[PDB]
Ligand binder design. Sequence first.
Ligand code: WJN
Ligand code: ZN
Length: 258
Amino acid sequence: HHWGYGKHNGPEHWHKDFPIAKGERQSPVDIDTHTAKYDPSLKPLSVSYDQATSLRILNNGHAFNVEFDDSQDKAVLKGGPLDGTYRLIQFHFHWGSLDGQGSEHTVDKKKYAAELHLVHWNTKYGDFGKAVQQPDGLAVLGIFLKVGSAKPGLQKVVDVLDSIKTKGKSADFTNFDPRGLLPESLDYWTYPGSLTTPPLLECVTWIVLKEPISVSSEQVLKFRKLNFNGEGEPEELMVDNWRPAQPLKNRQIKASFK
Ligand SMILES: NS(=O)(=O)c1ccc(NC(=O)Nc2ccc(C(F)(F)F)cc2)cc1
Ligand SMILES: [Zn+2]
């Protein structure tokens, strides 16, 4: 209820209301590239976003979510480590106050400027709320952002942020094509984990792409102008909305590539 990313309500406090914060399959994690093992058993990853139907963008006080119509199999993720069909429901990002931090996952302890999460639920469970109660309910495709060249397919997102500055604001966001946020390669790492925000449910198969996308400094600067607060409340810039790496415990990270 009053969780956030500050000193007084941040990740080190979450366990009091959400004891699974100290569980056995929490996310994010550091991806040690030397220890991850290539797995021949992985099937090809299939990202099928041609019929994706975006609807709205919402500042929820923690990030902003671009939401999709998930009432039919329009935009789906299949293959890789996944059994069956996972429907896209929303994407969001986590980012930093500085270009050297912001990602949730790390790669050999490297932090990226931001991380995109494309969230999908397993259609065998009928709805998102049921899926999050299952160990294989969700698949989140995570994509790192580094600062360099602009990402043209992100600009429509950046340009609507002025209209959702504060918590609880939303705006129409139709006809956005999430294909424009992907890198060229679908090479990935995968492991079983959790939501990275309360309620921290252990329901996610994480698929983290190896290739980052590049976004411009100007693009990420606009993310940092958002607010965690509601309208008419003291301004708190929406920055550093990332959970740090958690203990790997009894898990193995698998690579799709040699
Ligand atoms: N950072 S992360 O990728 O691990 C992650 C964290 C929290 C969530 N939660 C939701 O998407 N919640 C949600 C979606 C959708 C609905 C619906 F509208 F269907 F009720 C109700 C709740 C997802 C992902
Ligand atoms: Zn996330």
